[PDB]
Ligand binder design. Structure first.
Ligand SMILES: *[C@@H]1O[C@H](CO)[C@@H](O)[C@H](O[C@H]2O[C@H](CO)[C@H](O)[C@H](O)[C@H]2O)[C@H]1NC(C)=O
Ligand SMILES: [Pt+2]
Length: 158
């Protein structure tokens, strides 16, 4: 009468689940900041446009011509995407999101390569003047380990 065998099949499938669980824990999280990166990129057409027609970066959502409260640009895992001086920053939700990324953010910003803009993707940044941004790392930035290698630009990137 065989408990042992079953206890072994359970034992071997449960240390493997334990072993797999970190990887998929990290997998899911990269899939949830993907969305953040995609809600932020939607907005570059409008920021680019605004800068190009005028020489000034859009001050906010309403200058840039996108839904004026940031909370209207939201997703399954993102709460709000916000244009603040041409820099667009996406904040992750704090529900349905992995705890090491809940409520955290990234930013996309551009630089003028006179005639067009050049875009960057990375951890949050604040615009200091029409051509420099500075790190806005306040402790709520998405960790480097969950950002795609396409979205790893430091504040001074070019
Ligand atoms: C859109 O972005 C512009 C960047 O150059 C801002 O000036 C603009 O604000 C100006 O226009 C609004 C219109 O209601 C207000 O008069 C501000 O006081 C002006 O500075 C900005 N628009 C908004 C709604 O902030
Ligand atoms: Pt205008």
């Amino acid at each position: 009468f065989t408990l042992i065998e079953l206890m072994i099949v359970i034992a071997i499938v449960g240390i493997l689940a334990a072993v797999a669980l970190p990887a998929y824990q990290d997998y899911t999280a990269r899939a949830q900041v993907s969305e953040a990166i995609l809600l932020a990129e939607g907005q570059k057409s409008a920021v680019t446009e605004y800068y190009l027609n005028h020489g000034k970066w859009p001050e906010n959502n309403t200058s840039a011509g996108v839904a004026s409260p940031p909370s209207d640009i939201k997703g399954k895992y993102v709460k709000e995407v916000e244009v603040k001086n041409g820099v667009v920053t996406a904040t992750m939700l704090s529900s349905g999101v992995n705890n090491e990324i809940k409520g955290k953010k990234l930013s996309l910003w551009a630089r003028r390569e006179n005639g067009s803009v050049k875009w960057f993707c990375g951890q949050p940044v604040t615009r200091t003047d029409d051509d420099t941004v500075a790190d806005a790392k306040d402790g709520k930035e998405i960790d480097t380990k969950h950002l795609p290698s396409t979205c790893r630009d430091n504040f001074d990137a070019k």
